[PDB]
Scaffold this motif. Structure first.
Motif, PDB file in Angstrom:
ATOM      1  N   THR A 142       0.854  -1.190   0.000  1.00 21.76           N
ATOM      2  CA  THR A 142       0.000   0.000   0.000  1.00 21.76           C
ATOM      3  C   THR A 142       0.889   1.238   0.000  1.00 21.76           C
ATOM      4  O   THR A 142       0.974   1.964   0.998  1.00 21.76           O
ATOM      5  CB  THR A 142      -1.000   0.006   1.166  1.00 21.76           C
ATOM      6  OG1 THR A 142      -0.325  -0.151   2.426  1.00 21.76           O
ATOM      7  CG2 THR A 142      -1.996  -1.134   1.010  1.00 21.76           C
ATOM      8  N   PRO A 143       1.549   1.521  -1.129  1.00 26.34           N
ATOM      9  CA  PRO A 143       2.567   2.586  -1.124  1.00 26.34           C
ATOM     10  C   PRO A 143       2.012   3.980  -0.950  1.00 26.34           C
ATOM     11  O   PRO A 143       2.669   4.812  -0.324  1.00 26.34           O
ATOM     12  CB  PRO A 143       3.282   2.419  -2.474  1.00 26.34           C
ATOM     13  CG  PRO A 143       2.301   1.681  -3.322  1.00 26.34           C
ATOM     14  CD  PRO A 143       1.516   0.786  -2.403  1.00 26.34           C
ATOM     15  N   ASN A 144       0.838   4.286  -1.498  1.00 22.88           N
ATOM     16  CA  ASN A 144       0.341   5.649  -1.343  1.00 22.88           C
ATOM     17  C   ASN A 144      -0.083   5.925   0.096  1.00 22.88           C
ATOM     18  O   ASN A 144       0.225   6.988   0.645  1.00 22.88           O
ATOM     19  CB  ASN A 144      -0.775   5.936  -2.341  1.00 22.88           C
ATOM     20  CG  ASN A 144      -0.235   6.161  -3.727  1.00 22.88           C
ATOM     21  OD1 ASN A 144       0.867   6.689  -3.891  1.00 22.88           O
ATOM     22  ND2 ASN A 144      -0.990   5.751  -4.731  1.00 22.88           N
ATOM     23  N   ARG A 145      -0.792   4.976   0.716  1.00 22.07           N
ATOM     24  CA  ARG A 145      -1.125   5.074   2.132  1.00 22.07           C
ATOM     25  C   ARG A 145       0.138   5.206   2.968  1.00 22.07           C
ATOM     26  O   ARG A 145       0.243   6.086   3.837  1.00 22.07           O
ATOM     27  CB  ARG A 145      -1.899   3.810   2.544  1.00 22.07           C
ATOM     28  CG  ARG A 145      -2.068   3.579   4.068  1.00 22.07           C
ATOM     29  CD  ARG A 145      -3.089   4.511   4.609  1.00 22.07           C
ATOM     30  NE  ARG A 145      -3.614   4.161   5.943  1.00 22.07           N
ATOM     31  CZ  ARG A 145      -4.663   3.370   6.193  1.00 22.07           C
ATOM     32  NH1 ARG A 145      -5.315   2.756   5.215  1.00 22.07           N
ATOM     33  NH2 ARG A 145      -5.072   3.213   7.446  1.00 22.07           N
TER      34      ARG A 145
HETATM   35 CL   LIG Z   1      -2.011   2.605  -1.334  1.00 15.84          CL
END
Ligand SMILES: [Cl-]
Length: 162
Positions: A142-145
């Motif tokens: 979950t890179p954006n989170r």
């Molecule tokens: Cl994300």
């Protein structure tokens, strides 16, 4: 901004049972129902949580009350945990929100792998902690989170959410 607005942005709101990023049945503002593959098991957990026969659908008021309970449970879990409490108490109010956000998403068990990050946070080594937090399955899945939460730890501001 506060923890409720932060998590509402990160989790969204859905009033019917949905699947989270890992495939688990969820409802409302990110309320996990069960890790079982059975939709019937998820519907049963929902009815138990709400106190009525929901048939998989809730109201906005019900979603917001579940959310308040879930945030409170995350905070209480931090305060009862001998490893997490001293780190939490060392942080300013904005960074405390980033800590609650991680516990809400991954639980106490999911954050247990972050021992080295926790020590860097307690020492206020923000840039080093940010790099260490990114070297994780969490960041890769979950890179954006994770980027928003890490930026909050790095800067102590709400800039990632604005
Ligand atoms: Cl994300």
């Amino acid at each position: 901004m506060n923890i409720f607005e932060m998590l509402r942005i990160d989790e969204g709101l859905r009033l019917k049972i949905y699947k989270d990023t890992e495939g688990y049945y969820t409802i409302g503002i990110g309320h996990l129902l069960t890790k079982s593959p059975s939709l019937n098991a998820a519907k049963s957990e929902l009815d138990k949580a709400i106190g009525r026969n929901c048939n998989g659908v809730i109201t906005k008021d019900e979603a917001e009350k579940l959310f308040n309970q879930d945030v409170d449970a995350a905070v209480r879990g931090i305060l009862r945990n001998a490893k997490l409490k001293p780190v939490y108490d060392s942080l300013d109010a904005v960074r405390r929100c980033a800590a609650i956000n991680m516990v809400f998403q991954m639980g106490e068990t999911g954050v247990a792998g972050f021992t080295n990050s926790l020590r860097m946070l307690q020492q206020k080594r923000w840039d080093e902690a940010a790099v260490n937090l990114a070297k994780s399955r969490w960041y890769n899945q979950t890179p954006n989170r994770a980027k928003r939460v890490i930026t909050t730890f790095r800067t102590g501001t709400w800039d990632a959410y604005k």
